[PDB]
Amino acid sequence: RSSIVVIGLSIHTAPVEMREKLAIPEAEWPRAIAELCGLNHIEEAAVLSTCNRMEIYVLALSQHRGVKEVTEWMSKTSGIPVSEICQHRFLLYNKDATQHIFEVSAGLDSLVLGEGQILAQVKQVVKVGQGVNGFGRNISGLFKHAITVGKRVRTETNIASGAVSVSSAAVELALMKLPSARMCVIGAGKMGKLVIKHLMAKGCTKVVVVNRSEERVSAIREEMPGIEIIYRPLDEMLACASEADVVFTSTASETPLFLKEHVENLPQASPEVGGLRHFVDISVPRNVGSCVGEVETARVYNVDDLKEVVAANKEDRMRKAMEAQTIITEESTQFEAWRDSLETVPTIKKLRAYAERIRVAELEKCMSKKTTRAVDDLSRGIVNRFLHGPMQHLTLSETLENMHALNRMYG
Amino acid sequence: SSIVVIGLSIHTAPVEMREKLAIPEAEWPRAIAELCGLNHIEEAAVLSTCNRMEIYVLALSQHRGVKEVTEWMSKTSGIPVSEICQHRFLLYNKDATQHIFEVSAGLDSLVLGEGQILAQVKQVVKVGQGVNGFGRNISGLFKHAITVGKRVRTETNIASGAVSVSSAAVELALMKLPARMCVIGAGKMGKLVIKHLMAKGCTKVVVVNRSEERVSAIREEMPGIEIIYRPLDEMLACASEADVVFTSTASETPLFLKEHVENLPQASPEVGGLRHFVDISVPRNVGSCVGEVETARVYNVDDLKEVVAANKEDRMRKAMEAQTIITEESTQFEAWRDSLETVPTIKKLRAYAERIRVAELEKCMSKMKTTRAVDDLSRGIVNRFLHGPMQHLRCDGSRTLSETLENMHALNRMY
Ligand SMILES: NC(=O)c1ccc[n+]([C@@H]2O[C@H](COP(=O)([O-])OP(=O)(O)OC[C@H]3O[C@@H](n4cnc5c(N)ncnc54)[C@H](OP(=O)(O)O)[C@@H]3O)[C@@H](O)[C@H]2O)c1
Ligand SMILES: NC(=O)c1ccc[n+]([C@@H]2O[C@H](COP(=O)([O-])OP(=O)(O)OC[C@H]3O[C@@H](n4cnc5c(N)ncnc54)[C@H](OP(=O)(O)O)[C@@H]3O)[C@@H](O)[C@H]2O)c1
Incomplete structure (x- = not known):
């Protein structure tokens, strides 16, 4: 349900005199992230602050309200009015966002059409973020998978760093x-x-x-x-x-x-x-x-x-930037599968507790009529012999359908 | 497995040929068991009227079941296989159900001059009751035909055959x-x-x-x-x-x-x-x-x-609404029939659970008056743990079809 959102200014739109006001020193990334996660519809956040772009990646509860909050926050910290920012604001959701951050990390969105680029900066963001609570599973995963993509594309396209x-x-x-x-x-x-x-x-x-x-x-x-x-x-x-x-x-x-x-x-x-x-x-x-x-x-x-x-050997117009997009298309759908395989965590926990409420009620029901350890063990044995199977089933597409099934078949 | 209709009808075969295929009501049970005795025929029904002779089967393999049924038709009528092949009318699955719905309604495009076969469908079901080969798929098909025939009658008033x-x-x-x-x-x-x-x-x-x-x-x-x-x-x-x-x-x-x-x-x-x-x-x-x-x-x-045919067309009323009824029920039937692929996992699940339950119950009963309570616990825990997966394997037709069937494959994987 919840969306990964990208909300940014880039060189493709905003000028450097505007962009530099949202620049966030590396030493203030943890602070920025904490602030963003203080907003009511934002659960995770990361800032990617480079020379060509200032991009905020969030995990929002609501797309529209997430965007309103992050934009108001951009306005507060930069000094720039919401109206101006909206005019230069860059916005993508879910699949488009992961697509984007893959192209950025590969060098297929900045300025030359054959470049590194932001692979070093995506590694720096993951480094700095490791302590930062707001840098959670979803956004860290996105960035980590961006590192993977960056490296693959680099060896194929052989495109020099940004x-x-x-x-x-x-x-x-x-x-x-x-x-001279x-x-x-x-x-x-x-x-x-x-x-x-x-x-x-x-x-x-x-x-x-x-x-x-x-x-x-x-x-x-x-x-x-x-x-x-x-x-x-x-x-x-x-x-x-x-x-x-x-x-x-x-x-x-x-x-x-x-x-x-x-x-x-x-x-x-x-x-x-x-x-x-x-x-x-x-x-x-x-x-x-x-x-x-x-x-x-x-x-x-x-x-x-x-x-x-x-101007630097424009013949990579296709080659580099073509060989890379196939990598990006396969890693995306790979990542989405990975993201979907995260809701499998709430299921393992819950399903266990679901059987635990039945176990308890039936146990209690029986005990009103060390034989007590016998029936306690009987109640644990029956449940474990029904959880054990589903325990590993939670390929990745069959593991996913297993998860969706338990949810439909229970809660 | 497919539903197959294999027929001769007045669309192509004269009565001098059709009558050799005619099968008296008292011999439906024998015929169905002869038919179901074929290697690829799991279920069968015989629809014998003055305009047609149709066998409805559930076959393991489309070409093999048809060749086997065709041979049986030849063997029981005297008519050589090549004459039968010349006249043979063939439809599979959704086309067959659409067909029997139309025949039952008196709306067979190829046999315009027949009238509703609803009475005869009702009889086939009635006699089918006690007949082993008249299985869940084919009786279901025919019962759904009955429902369609009645509805269509109430809407168009097409007379009986x-x-x-x-x-x-x-x-x-x-x-x-x-x-x-x-x-x-x-x-x-x-x-x-x-x-x-x-x-x-x-x-x-x-x-x-x-x-x-x-x-x-x-x-x-x-x-x-x-x-x-x-x-x-x-x-x-x-x-x-x-x-x-x-x-x-x-x-x-x-x-x-x-x-x-x-x-x-x-x-x-x-x-x-x-x-x-x-x-x-x-x-x-x-x-x-x-x-x-x-x-x-x-x-x-x-x-x-x-x-x-002339009289049927003269007195024709509400054709479109009739064809709507047929189109929709066709898909409703396919829905119900897709639903049926859930029965084997339900039994396997239930055997699985019962084997766990008794195994664990005998463990507890070798470590201990109050034996029905301890029994009740075991069945209580199983049944309550199973009830969700038991109400999410039974459906009518709508959406939940794909989900229901995906629960099946999941339950197959996890156990
Ligand atoms: N790195 C990139 O991929 C990228 C690409 C294009 C442009 N840029 C931009 O170019 C600039 C430099 O980036 P970088 O990667 O070269 O950084 P860097 O390797 O970390 O070093 C920055 C340099 O600036 C000096 N410095 C830091 N703070 C200073 C201050 N307050 N006053 C005077 N000097 C200071 C440092 O001196 P010390 O060595 O003595 O500490 C260091 O030599 C940044 O504005 C960056 O945004 C970055
Ligand atoms: N029913 C239809 O929708 C349909 C439509 C068109 C034509 N037909 C055909 O018309 C014929 C009669 O069908 P039905 O449904 O009216 O039959 P039915 O109600 O079952 O009665 C058949 C009649 O035939 C007589 N009969 C039976 N065996 C006989 C024999 N060996 N020799 C002389 N008479 C005999 C019976 O005599 P008893 O009274 O002494 O028993 C009875 O009067 C059948 O050939 C059938 O195929 C049927």
Whole structure:
């Protein structure tokens, strides 16, 4: 009866300036989930917060009321009015929802038509969620089965991770906008490391890397001997951007690192590269204020702006994204069977108790007329000899029909 | 297992051939047991009338049961298997039930000239009672036919085969004249022929019967007509004094052959010196050779078929509603018949439970006045645990069919 619902904003609809207001740091996922499960028609929840999407997966008692509650909650936490959110809201139920989260995890819904993508993020959601009570059987199962799908599709389609494609796209765009340009990367985590790899493969031999800690950059430097990596601590940020022509920002900061004030005071980029400083900001929330675009000699790009790249062997238009959909169609119906095989739990318990109410009444009825252990045992023996059979019968399609039968034949 | 109808009917076979297949009511039990004695025939019924001969069976295998029944038909009629094959009418399952519902209603598309066989269906069920082979599927089929026939009668008022045959007999006889009436046989059909003679204005009839009791009874119940009894041995003389002779005895051999009637003096010149034999008996009471006599005309139930059909259509009312009744009950029957596949699991379940119960009861009774209580506990627990699965295996027809049957397979798996 109860529905699994997906309720989201994605890059397919909402802009990054809208989407980043529903962004939920990993450290606040357990809090978010608890809040959602506090709503009257929501029993389980999970948040999938990535750069292309903010998606809330719930197990709702009522579809309509679940959607009203989660949407009102989105409005409260983000600051965004319900009316705006509804205009960009994405909504699917049950089979469509599991279908969706399978395509997302496989890389068949985001932005390039041949991508990872969210397999790493679906694993992170399962990790973080293990302690979280609200992350119950249904939604955890969905996500776990999404991990399975992600991996299968990955080996068939061989489609690179979403992290690989966004970083790849950042380098292509920078090289697109440029007519030796000085490269600078702020945030040496997974993504900035990827940006650096893509710059190397493009032939870049020197990059200045600004990071919170030096240790990460030390690792990367040790790991990539071929290129000259120059570490700079975060408080030297503004010096770096001024000695750079393009600035990649890839940090988990929840507030912009650059406002209009910071960049207008920066010396102009070299005329050799057109006199413009290209801020390529692949962070969500963004590390660059959109006001920076008011600065004449500056250019700002965010994840949404990687859409005018999307060019990398388009022949996977079918192959990858075709070989994968068959996987998705078989795993879905497999998962639905699995979901249906969960109501088998309330049945095993109940049926036992159903026979236990008959056993007790008849026992009691008899005892009003250690022979007492004899008849107690007789009453247990008859019942166990009737439960024992149905105990294992609760293939999976025959186990399912067994369950439905007991329910019809009893309660 | 399928329900099969295997028939010859006036749609294709003349009476000279049909009558060889005719099976008297006293021999239904023998025939059904002969039939059920075949390797693939679990149940059987014989529907013998003047327009048709139909065997209804429950067969293990469609082609094998049919070949076996066909052989039995040939073996009991004298008719070679290849002639029978030529005329053989065949329908399976839902088509067969639809068919028997129509025949019972007097709505057989292929035999338009017959009238309701409801009386004859009721008789088959009545005689079937004591007949081993007349099983639950076929008796059920026939009983449902009975219900359909009655409903359809109440809605359309299609006459019986009996009424419509005797009525056609008199009508035809009157069409062939521009008359001294004789009727041979005073049972159901002959009484009806007399009634239709009165209905038409006849005030005198010579009635030849084997026993007088029947004719005395008729004589008394119909005081307005002069009824002249005459023993069977005199029937030839009666013929020589009649201008039309109705024959309607259950004799399985002919009463008049050509030698008998070429002998007789010519019928009155006032009816055109032709003596009309209207023979409504199957098997025929009048030899066909009688038609070779120049001053004579013979007719049999085959010749009535058009005049029966015309009258049935003339008096036709509420055809659609009738066909609705048939379509719906057909599916209601299939529903009831699907329901029956639940009986074996019910018994197996009940044997299973009883074996557990006594086993556990004897355990307790080897460890111990109060023996009926401890007994009661055991049956009480079983019956109460079983009652749900026992009311969810019995249904009528609606939905719950698929569920009921899925409980069956589940109960099969879990035990
Ligand atoms: N990962 C993806 O699949 C994906 C794809 C595209 C874009 N993005 C976006 O890109 C950004 C980075 O993601 P990531 O996966 O690279 O993260 P990550 O591996 O966890 O590292 C984030 C980096 O940002 C730094 N950082 C964290 N908080 C900061 C703060 N408050 N101020 C300044 N620096 C801070 C960290 O420095 P330390 O090493 O010293 O801790 C680290 O180098 C995020 O906004 C993310 O949403 C993610
Ligand atoms: N009933 C129908 O719906 C139907 C329709 C059309 C035609 N028919 C045919 O018409 C014939 C009569 O049927 P029914 O239902 O009217 O019969 P019925 O009520 O059972 O009576 C049959 C009559 O035939 C006589 N009879 C029986 N055996 C005889 C024999 N060996 N020799 C001379 N007479 C004999 C009987 O004499 P007793 O009185 O002395 O016993 C009785 O008068 C049958 O051949 C039948 O197939 C039947």
